[PDB]
Design an enzyme around this catalytic site. Sequence first.
Site, PDB file in Angstrom:
ATOM      1  N   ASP A   1      39.120  33.934  33.644  1.00 41.41           N
ATOM      2  CA  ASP A   1      37.746  34.244  34.068  1.00 41.41           C
ATOM      3  C   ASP A   1      36.700  33.604  33.141  1.00 41.41           C
ATOM      4  OD1 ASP A   1      35.694  35.328  35.560  1.00 41.41           O
ATOM      5  OD2 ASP A   1      35.776  37.344  34.784  1.00 41.41           O
TER       6      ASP A   1
ATOM      7  N   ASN B   1      40.456  41.007  33.212  1.00 44.37           N
ATOM      8  CA  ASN B   1      40.626  39.559  33.024  1.00 44.37           C
ATOM      9  C   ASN B   1      41.697  39.186  32.022  1.00 44.37           C
ATOM     10  OD1 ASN B   1      37.411  39.047  31.516  1.00 44.37           O
ATOM     11  ND2 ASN B   1      39.354  39.564  30.604  1.00 44.37           N
TER      12      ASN B   1
ATOM     13  N   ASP C   1      32.917  37.893  28.730  1.00 42.92           N
ATOM     14  CA  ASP C   1      33.249  38.933  29.692  1.00 42.92           C
ATOM     15  C   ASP C   1      34.680  39.444  29.535  1.00 42.92           C
ATOM     16  OD1 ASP C   1      32.677  40.737  31.789  1.00 42.92           O
ATOM     17  OD2 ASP C   1      32.924  39.257  33.360  1.00 42.92           O
TER      18      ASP C   1
HETATM   19  N1  LIG Z   1      45.938  33.261  37.933  1.00 41.41           N
HETATM   20  C1  LIG Z   1      46.127  34.391  38.631  1.00 41.41           C
HETATM   21  N2  LIG Z   1      47.370  34.934  38.881  1.00 41.41           N
HETATM   22  C2  LIG Z   1      47.497  36.160  39.522  1.00 41.41           C
HETATM   23  N3  LIG Z   1      46.360  36.843  39.922  1.00 41.41           N
HETATM   24  C3  LIG Z   1      45.137  36.309  39.675  1.00 41.41           C
HETATM   25  C4  LIG Z   1      45.006  35.084  39.034  1.00 41.41           C
HETATM   26  N4  LIG Z   1      43.690  34.777  38.915  1.00 41.41           N
HETATM   27  C5  LIG Z   1      42.983  35.823  39.456  1.00 41.41           C
HETATM   28  N5  LIG Z   1      43.865  36.769  39.903  1.00 41.41           N
HETATM   29  C6  LIG Z   1      43.530  38.020  40.608  1.00 41.41           C
HETATM   30  O1  LIG Z   1      42.606  37.689  41.612  1.00 41.41           O
HETATM   31  C7  LIG Z   1      41.394  38.405  41.409  1.00 41.41           C
HETATM   32  C8  LIG Z   1      40.222  37.589  41.930  1.00 41.41           C
HETATM   33  O2  LIG Z   1      39.835  36.683  40.948  1.00 41.41           O
HETATM   34  P1  LIG Z   1      38.473  35.830  41.157  1.00 41.41           P
HETATM   35  O3  LIG Z   1      38.362  34.855  39.967  1.00 41.41           O
HETATM   36  O4  LIG Z   1      38.532  35.177  42.494  1.00 41.41           O
HETATM   37  O5  LIG Z   1      37.254  36.901  41.251  1.00 41.41           O
HETATM   38  P2  LIG Z   1      36.942  38.138  40.237  1.00 41.41           P
HETATM   39  O6  LIG Z   1      36.651  37.601  38.830  1.00 41.41           O
HETATM   40  O7  LIG Z   1      38.024  39.153  40.304  1.00 41.41           O
HETATM   41  O8  LIG Z   1      35.588  38.859  40.761  1.00 41.41           O
HETATM   42  P3  LIG Z   1      34.104  38.305  40.443  1.00 41.41           P
HETATM   43  O9  LIG Z   1      34.078  36.808  40.379  1.00 41.41           O
HETATM   44  O10 LIG Z   1      33.204  38.814  41.584  1.00 41.41           O
HETATM   45  O11 LIG Z   1      33.649  38.810  39.070  1.00 41.41           O
HETATM   46  C9  LIG Z   1      41.371  38.786  39.927  1.00 41.41           C
HETATM   47  O12 LIG Z   1      40.510  39.908  39.689  1.00 41.41           O
HETATM   48  C10 LIG Z   1      42.850  39.052  39.704  1.00 41.41           C
HETATM   49  O13 LIG Z   1      43.254  40.334  40.159  1.00 41.41           O
END
Ligand SMILES: Nc1ncnc2c1ncn2[C@@H]1O[C@H](COP(=O)(O)OP(=O)(O)OP(=O)(O)O)[C@@H](O)[C@H]1O
Length: 287
Positions: free
Chosen positions: A152, A139, A134
């Site tokens: 991700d 990501n 993905d």
């Molecule tokens: N390590 C990090 N540091 C800063 N921001 C982060 C970090 N990890 C994730 N994010 C931010 O938080 C968001 C949410 O991440 P999360 O893994 O909770 O769900 P998502 O992948 O965005 O959505 P989905 O799981 O529905 O596909 C990300 O899209 C990104 O903008």
Amino acid sequence: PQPRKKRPEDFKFGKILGEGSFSTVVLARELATSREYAIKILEKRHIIKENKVPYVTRERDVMSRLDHPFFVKLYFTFQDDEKLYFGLSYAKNGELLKYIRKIGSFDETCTRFYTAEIVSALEYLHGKGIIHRDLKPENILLNEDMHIQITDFGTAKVLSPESKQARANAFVGTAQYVSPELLTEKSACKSSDLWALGCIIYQLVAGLPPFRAGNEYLIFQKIIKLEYDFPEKFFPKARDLVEKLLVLDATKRLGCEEMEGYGPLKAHPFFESVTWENLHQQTPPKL
Ligand SMILES: Nc1ncnc2c1ncn2[C@@H]1O[C@H](COP(=O)(O)OP(=O)(O)OP(=O)(O)O)[C@@H](O)[C@H]1O
């Protein structure tokens, strides 16, 4: 003997950084150290109800295996009665997608530098037998020094020594970056990420991904037909590279095992001025 298991009471939680379908990422400061982490919080009940135990387990297991500067680091995990907590590096600068939207499209120096970091990251991942599955600008995060931090991994596939392919649904993953093999054979390989790489390079140069349309069905139709065009003034060596990545036959993409791996990819004329050995110690060009 590791450090004692952390608890929610060890942190001052702050702003929400992002919200997914099964998780919420919150900025947290550890009281004892003043260190800031991005803590991903997932509710156990919801994960179980929606049958997502394999994905959460996969995300944890892959992240613990990675040890490379171009990946989000997993520092710790813990849980309470209802929630799992993953302590992640805090990527202060957010998503690469943010910068693509902000500045519109990258110049050649910037495209080359960021493409190189992504290619270097994929080399590492693929050498471990992991397919991201993905990969997309959402990501690819950016640290405080504007180096990439890929994240991700819940939808990643871990290949066994004996296998180069893994069963995978296209309706899972982001439509614009889905490889044709997911739509035709319902299988993913390392080369699926190289297809995504081609989409991403196209997006950095053109400002938008190559396969766009009003809905997913229409995007998928364009993917299986290779229906896309390059804008005028698309940097010629980058066009050549993208043409070598957006190839319907997964075995003919530059970088794949059947094309003799990352050597020939990193030797592409688009990367002529790149020094590959120490990208994370180089100063990124200003966007
Ligand atoms: N390590 C990090 N540091 C800063 N921001 C982060 C970090 N990890 C994730 N994010 C931010 O938080 C968001 C949410 O991440 P999360 O893994 O909770 O769900 P998502 O992948 O965005 O959505 P989905 O799981 O529905 O596909 C990300 O899209 C990104 O903008």
